[PDB]
């Protein structure tokens, strides 16, 4: 009956809220895992990745540049795994 419609409406509201929360918070929440990894094992490879997000957080102008360069910095993971 109305239970299915209520569930569908709740799912739609949850999706809208999740999208809004992501669009509002992910720009800062992205660097959290990188910071946790950098603090987990301090290394020269992770230092540049940490510093990029550190400078990006203060100046939002370089934030899109840091988001673009995140993939370039992550390339060191394959080299570290191979070594």
Q: Which of 59, 26, 22, 54 is nearest to 38 (CA)?
A: 54
- Work out how close the CB of 21 gets to other proteins at its nearest, in angstroms, rounded to a whole number: 9
- Binders of other proteins among residues 16 to 55 (CB under 8 A) are 19, 22-23, 26, 28, 30-31, 33-37, 39-44, 47, 50-51, 54-55
CA 57, 70, 64 angle in degrees (round to 5)?
50
Cβ partners under 8 Å of residue 48, min gap 6: 73
- Work out how close the CB of 4 gets to other proteins at its nearest, in angstroms, rounded to a whole number: 20
Q: Which is nearer to other proteins, 3 or 81 (CB)?
A: 81
Q: Does 14 bind other proteins (CB under 8 A)?
A: no
């Amino acid at each position: 009956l109305d239970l299915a419609a209520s569930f569908s409406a709740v799912l739609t509201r949850i999706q809208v809220f999740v999208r809004r929360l992501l669009e509002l918070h992910v720009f800062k929440l992205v660097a959290l895992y990188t910071v946790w990894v950098a603090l987990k094992e301090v290394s020269v490879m992770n230092l540049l990745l940490v510093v990029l997000w550190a400078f990006a957080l203060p100046y939002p102008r370089f934030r899109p540049m840091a988001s673009c360069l995140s993939t370039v910095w992550t390339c060191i993971i394959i080299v570290c795994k191979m070594l």
